[PDB]
Amino acid sequence: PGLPPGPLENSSAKLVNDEAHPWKPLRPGDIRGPCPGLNTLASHGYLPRNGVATPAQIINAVQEGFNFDNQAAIFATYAAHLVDGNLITDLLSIGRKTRLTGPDPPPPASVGGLNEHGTFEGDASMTRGDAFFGNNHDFNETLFEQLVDYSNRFGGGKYNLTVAGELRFKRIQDSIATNPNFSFVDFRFFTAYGETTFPANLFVDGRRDDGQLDMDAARSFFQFSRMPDDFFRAPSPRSGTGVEVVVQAHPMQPGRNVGKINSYTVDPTSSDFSTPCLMYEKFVNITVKSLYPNPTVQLRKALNTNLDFLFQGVAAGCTQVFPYGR
Ligand code: HEM
Numbered sequence: 447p448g449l450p451p452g453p454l455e456n457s458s459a460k461l462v463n464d465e466a467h468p469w470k471p472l473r474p475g476d477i478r479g480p481c482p483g484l485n486t487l488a489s490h491g492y493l494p495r496n497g498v499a500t501p502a503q504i505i506n507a508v509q510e511g512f513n514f515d516n517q518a519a520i521f522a523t524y525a526a527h528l529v530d531g532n533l534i535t536d537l538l539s540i541g542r543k544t545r546l547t548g549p550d551p552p553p554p555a556s557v558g559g560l561n562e563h564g565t566f567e568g569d570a571s572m573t574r575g576d577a578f579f580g581n582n583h584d585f586n587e588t589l590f591e592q593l594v595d596y597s598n599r600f601g602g603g604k605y606n607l608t609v610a611g612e613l614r615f616k617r618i619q620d621s622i623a624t625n626p627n628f629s630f631v632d633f634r635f636f637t638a639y640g641e642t643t644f645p646a647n648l649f650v651d652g653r654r655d656d657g658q659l660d661m662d663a664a665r666s667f668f669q670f671s672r673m674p675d676d677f678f679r680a681p682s683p684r685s686g687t688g689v690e691v692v693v694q695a696h697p698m699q700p701g702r703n704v705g706k707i708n709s710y711t712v713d714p715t716s717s718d719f720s721t722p723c724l725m726y727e728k729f730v731n732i733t734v735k736s737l738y739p740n741p742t743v744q745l746r747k748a749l750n751t752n753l754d755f756l757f758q759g760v761a762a763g764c765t766q767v768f769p770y771g772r
Pocket residue numbers: 480481482483484504508512514518519522523526560566567568569570571572573574637641642644645648649
């Protein structure tokens with residue numbers, strides 16, 4: 447594995463929909479998944495256009511194309527790679543499972559790409575349906591139209607953090623009401639909130655950076671993986687700033703439905719926003735370790751390297767944990 451890239455040398459706003467990075471349609475075999483950011487980077491050639499990439503390629507692409515901040519890029523990328531990528535070949539699919547990531551490790555590891563439900567991807571996404579309903583990765587028009595409606599109602603026709611706060615809660619309540627397997631704990635509990643800020647922070651043209659995303663731009667990213675014509679990236683590195691507004695709108699406890707609709711039951715063993723270090727510790731000790739309980743020599747080495755890289759993205763104050771020793 448390569449070292450995690452460092453922050454941008456020059457993080458100014460600039461044209462990112464440029465001559466070197468044109469949008470192109472999908473070819474047969476090209477993979478897109480549940481993340482409109484990575485999808486857009488692949489469809490503009492910031493990532494390989496087939497949607498299979500190394501962690502270093504992903505980190506460079508999110509920084510260069512969108513000004514995603516370095517710490518956030520490192521944590522997300524290595525978390526995804528650990529649970530969804532091939533640690534020997536150093537390749538991760540941004541969507542469905544593919545033979546392009548190379549020879550698989552033994553069960554119970556899945557190397558399922560970002561489409562793998564319950565590892566990184568989870569329920570109550572804004573524009574993708576819950577995995578229980580049959581498709582956790584494709585753009586959903588009905589859900590996008592709901593995003594438009596919430597933008598009309600709470601954002602004057604634009605998507606902003608106020609809209610995010612209301613839509614985040616709506617999606618949770620809809621999953622509680624209809625998905626008997628709804629899960630909203632630990633890693634998904636965190637990412638579900640942060641992801642709702644990303645359209646306001648990163649899909650807004652960086653010459654404005656006003657947190658007000660228009661619906662034409664929103665559809666372009668969410669549906670077509672396409673930057674608006676003349677799109678400038680954000681003017682400074684960021685990811686989840688303003689997530690507090692989203693949480694404050696409708697504070698929730700982590701929990702799950704318990705095999706029936708309308709049975710949301712709080713999980714006191716889950717991390718929440720009061721215990722961010724616990725979220726990291728459980729991700730490593732439980733989630734990663736369960737996929738690789740007794741790895742062979744070359745896998746153990748790759749796990750430890752990628753776990754070291756993951757820890758670079760963890761907020762200062764947390765203690766590193768070592769599931770396979772040092
Ligand atoms: C840094 C590497 C990144 C990885 C590995 C990644 C991966 C993912 C995954 C797997 C999801 C699905 C979560 C869910 O179940 O809803 C997701 C959600 C999302 N990501 Fe990313 N992401 C990354 C960075 C970014 C960036 C830079 C952007 C924007 C520039 C972005 C925008 C989004 C949005 C908007 C969603 C929610 C989509 C929806 O709910 O419809 N992500 N990401």
